[PDB]
Each structure stands twice: as C-alpha cells, then as structure tokens.
Design a protein around this ligand. Structure first.
Ligand SMILES: C[As](C)(=O)[O-]
Ligand SMILES: C[As](C)(=O)[O-]
Ligand SMILES: [Zn+2]
Ligand SMILES: [Zn+2]
Ligand SMILES: [Zn+2]
Ligand SMILES: [Zn+2]
Lengths: 329, 331
C-alpha cells in the first residue's frame, strides 16, 4: 500500500527517490537470453554492461528504474535481481504482455490472462518469488481483439491489486485514446495508468486531453533520435528523426499547460536488444553514450535552463513516480 | 556414425531399440512452462503424467523417443531429462525452429540461425550441457522467406554435425517438395531428411516420389485421425476425418513399393499442450487413450494382420530410426 515490489523485495515509497519509469535491462524474447546468451556476447558480459550503466545512472542521481520488460520481451527477473543488487539501484519488475505474445499466450482468454498477471503480482515471477510492481501492455494504433483482452486483463489485475498499468502506444496514431476507452469500460481509474511513448508525437491537444482526464503521460523516449543516421534505414525507423530537444520541449509544454503532476519521464533505454536488427545496440550507444543517465545529465539541466523550477523537476522525477507506483485501490 | 546424444548423455546405436521418431513431452512456447506452470496444473503434475505415459509406451516395447519440440515449442530439456530418468526411456532432444518463432529469432540471418542450431547440437541447450540429436523445422504453404532461412540453417548445421533434419509439412499441399528443393540446393543428402506429417494425405505418388529420391517419410500422425468430432470447432484442423487404419495402410503401400527402409512411424503425441485452445489435451486423450502407445499397441498389430512380417516391422521401428539418428556425412 505504502510499499512497492522490487526485485530485491518490498521497499517504502520514500526509498524510491529519483525514478525512471520506463526502462529495460534487456529487450529480448521469452526464453531467448537463456537459450542463446552468446547473442549478447555472454550473460556475464550483459550483466556487467547493465551494472556499469546502472551505476553511472546512480552516480547521476537515479535511485529506481522500472523495467517494463514483459514475459514476451524476454524479461529475466533473475538477471534484474543480479544487476540491481550489484548496482544497488532499485528495479521494479513488470507483468503484462507486449507486442510479441507466443501462441501459448495469444490463445488465452481474458480470464486466463487475468490469472497470469495476478500470479506474477501476487505470487511471484516463475519460481523466483519476485513480484511484479507494474503491468505493462502494448497495442498497435487500432487495438486488435487479442490486445483488447490483454488491456481488460490488465485493468482487472490492477483493480484487484492496486498496481498500475503502463502502455506502449503509437502516439502518431493517438493510440492512448483507444486504450483509455477500454480501461475506463472496466472501471479502472486513469490515475492508475501511464500512456507511454507519448513523446513520439507533437500533438499537444492529444496529450493535454489525456492529462486532463487524470492519465499519466509517459514522455519516455527522449534520447531516441537517428539525426545524423538518415543513411541507416533500420535505425531511422526505430529512433525517428525528431531531436531529443524536440521531445524534451513536450515536458515543458505540459508543465506550461498546468499538468506537471501527470508527467513521467524516462529514456526507454536498454543494455541488450535482440528483438530488433543485429548490432542495433552499437548504433544506439553511439547516439546516446549517456544511456539511462541521459535524463538527469542532459534533460534536467535543459529544462532548468528553460526556466522550469527545481521543485517542479523534483516533483516530476520523484513525486509523480511515487504516486504512480504506490499500490492504490 | 556411432553415438546418439540423449538428454541423459550419449548412447550407442544398439541401445536405442524401438524408437518413436516424432513425439513431444509438452507442446508449448518458449519460457511458458516456467512462467506459468499452473496452466498444466503444476510442473510436478505434468512431469508425473509424462512419466506414466512413457512407462506405458515402454511396457509396449518403446525404448527411445525423439522429442521434436524446438525452442519455440517451449522445449524444456531439464523436464525431458527428469522424465527420461524416471521412465527409463531414452529421449533425444531437438534444435531448430517450428512455426512460432519470436522476434529475436524472426529477425536473424541464415548465418545467425546456423550458429544457434550449432550451439544446441555442439555445445548444449541453455546451460544444461544437453546436446540436441536432431534438427526440427517447419513450413507452411510454399515456404515463407523466413522459413527458407530456417531450412537452409538447418541444412548447414546438419552438414557440419551429421545430425539429421526432420520436418513439419502440410502434406495436403505437397509441402515436402519445396522443402526437398531447398535442402538439395544446400547439398544436403536426402538420407539425412525426414519429411514429416506425411500420413495426412492420400496422395501416394507424392510420398513414393520422395522416398524414391531417398527421403525418409514420416508417417507420424496416425492416431490424430479422430472420427466423431465434427461438432468441435477445433478438432478437425488438429485432428482428422479419416480413420487411423486408412493412414496405417500408407505404411503397407510404401513397403509394397519397396521403400520399407524409407519409413519412420510415430504418434506425434504429447502430455501437455498450451499452444492451442484450452482443454485440448482432454479432447486428445479421450480420442486416443493409448497416447504414445498407439503405434506399438494398435498400428503394429494391424500391419501384422495385413501380412507385414516381423522382420519388416522391426526394420521400420528399430533399424530405420537408428540409421537416421546416427550422425553421418557419408550419404
Ligand atoms: C521494447 As520498446 C522499443 O517497445 O520500448
Ligand atoms: C507441435 As505439432 C501439432 O506441429 O506436431
Ligand atoms: Zn514500447
Ligand atoms: Zn520500452
Ligand atoms: Zn508438426
Ligand atoms: Zn509434432
């Protein structure tokens, strides 16, 4: 209630501190890291890269990250536990389903999916005893029949446990509006929901309207930009060619509209990425060598330079994630 | 070759005995059994059902099964090792890819897939040290671009290791022809390849032509011809309308053409099945209560009463799988 689940166990909200609410240790597929660790060099290499990055993030002030990797994103909670302890950075794990559910998931009913999400929240992930502190879901512009089942199961699990829901959207297609409609039809409060990847669009009418309804707005891909990489089609398709300053200005824009309390900010970074083209991680690490420290090192001063008060920035990076993550019936 | 890798380690060809060459302990999805074991009741319950099933097949004469569950069929080799040890039945594990690869597989090149298949054959599966003894691949229609990559990677892994390739086809679409074409373009000998689910057609000329080219013909879904389930909206696509005796006669027909050495028979059974609609296992177990014992208890006697001599049935069930599974690069 005043405590949230992490991969090291329960912590009080006051311990969460500066929190990044949409991150990944490794973006992969179910079973993949354990079946083919050499894809990442080795499991050891991957863990060490994550520990170095989390430590640099910690140096820059980060105390908690939320790993929104689901089952079908190849979430390995044992890896999360290992790197969280070695970095001494809190990591909140996720249940839910992303965009790559296997047959054994996509043939399930809303009731079955509800039970799977509840298992991971109430009992534990796999046989680790580690409990999810958030439910991650994903849709593609026009919500598919299966994706709708996932969103309803997520709402039902959220209503039963008080843990929040966070989403993947195509903001260019105003995806949050379809998601919100489903959530509310299940009686879920918007205060329990983050509409993510919302910095992918410059449509302020879309963002403010969701914010006005009490939704959290996930401006979570700030460092993603293929500017200077236009000759790389795969990188351009993934990162887009909007600048990080462009993305960041949306944070200021929503503050200026009076919605500072609805903003969540993150890097959507990762230290391995097998569910995309080979060597994409090298491209991303040259674009953003700061990794997950990009937000405190580059974005926060940018905003302070634009005249946003320190107290407002602290409220966005500490207070908002705390209110969001804290299980609330 | 001389030794075949199993989930308990290497065995000599003579130790293999009566072998079922296309089976599953559990048809699932990668990561699924460990993330949601309660879907099967529990891991323990699934394990215990498999051990009873394998002990029943063993009492009917079976000594080895080949579990052709791939990574994306949620193969759990630790489970296979457990069940194998408790049932005293050899289990050969598979590498390769079936029809549900995740993004991290679907985005890989033929060269990368080759490395993955090779790691599972040469080094081991996951961190278990258990090595695959067969490469399983699957196609639909006229073979998709990704499936062609898988078949080529499988051929390359087979050529580097001598381990055979076994396939999932749509026999009604003569799917084996396109698979064979791809394998032969890679310089793979047809004697290293089993074209599976071949009993799901009545087109004997299609099967005979493949056997003539030296392919192994996998007659492996004999008990799936259901009969009685046209009211069910899922038991005609996974099961059948024909009778099992009709399928079984395909075996005799190939024997009579002189291709007994090209025949492999199996049940394609399983003890859990999460990659389908809920409760399908109850439907399947009710239609075929023999499970993996269907072949030795029903099909072998049926063939014997159709005039097939003991030496021929033993060649098919013992000799052919031994020759197939023994790692070889000598055509
Ligand atoms: C794993 As992602 C690029 O949907 O945040
Ligand atoms: C796992 As199957 C039904 O293709 O043999
Ligand atoms: Zn996303
Ligand atoms: Zn993400
Ligand atoms: Zn098959
Ligand atoms: Zn099969």
């Amino acid at each position: 209630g005043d405590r949230i689940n992490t991969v090291r166990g329960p912590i009080t909200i006051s311990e969460a501190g500066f929190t990044l609410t949409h991150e990944h240790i490794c973006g992969s597929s179910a079973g993949f890291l354990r079946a083919w660790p050499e894809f990442f060099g080795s499991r050891k290499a991957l863990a060490e890269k994550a520990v170095r990055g989390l430590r640099r993030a910690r140096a820059a002030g980060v105390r908690t990250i939320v790993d929104v990797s689901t089952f079908d994103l190849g979430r390995d909670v044992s890896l999360l536990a290992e790197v969280s302890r070695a970095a001494d950075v809190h990591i909140v794990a996720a249940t839910g389903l992303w965009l790559d559910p296997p047959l054994s998931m996509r043939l399930r009913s809303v009731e079955e999916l509800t039970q799977f999400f509840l298992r991971e929240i109430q009992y534990g992930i796999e046989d680790t005893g580690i409990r999810a502190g958030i439910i991650k879901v994903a849709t593609t512009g026009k919500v598919t029949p299966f994706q709708e089942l996932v969103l309803r199961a997520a709402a039902r699990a959220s209503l039963a446990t008080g843990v929040p829901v966070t989403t993947h959207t195509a903001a260019s297609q105003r995806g949050g509006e379809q998601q919100a409609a489903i959530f509310e039809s299940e009686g879920l409060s918007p205060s329990r929901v983050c509409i993510g990847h919302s910095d992918e669009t410059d449509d302020l009418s879309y963002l403010t309207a969701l914010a006005a309804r009490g939704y959290l707005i996930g401006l979570d891909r700030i460092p993603h930009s293929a500017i200077g990489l236009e000759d790389n089609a795969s990188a351009s398709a993934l990162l887009g060619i909007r600048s990080w300053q462009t993305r960041a200005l949306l944070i200021k824009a929503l503050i200026d509209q009076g919605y500072m309390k609805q903003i969540l900010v993150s890097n959507d970074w990762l230290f391995g990425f097998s569910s995309y083209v080979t060597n994409i991680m090298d491209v991303m690490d040259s674009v953003n060598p700061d990794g997950m420290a990009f937000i405190p090192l580059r974005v926060i001063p940018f905003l302070r330079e634009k005249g946003i008060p320190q107290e407002t920035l602290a409220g966005i990076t500490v207070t908002n994630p705390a209110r969001f993550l804290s299980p609330t019936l």
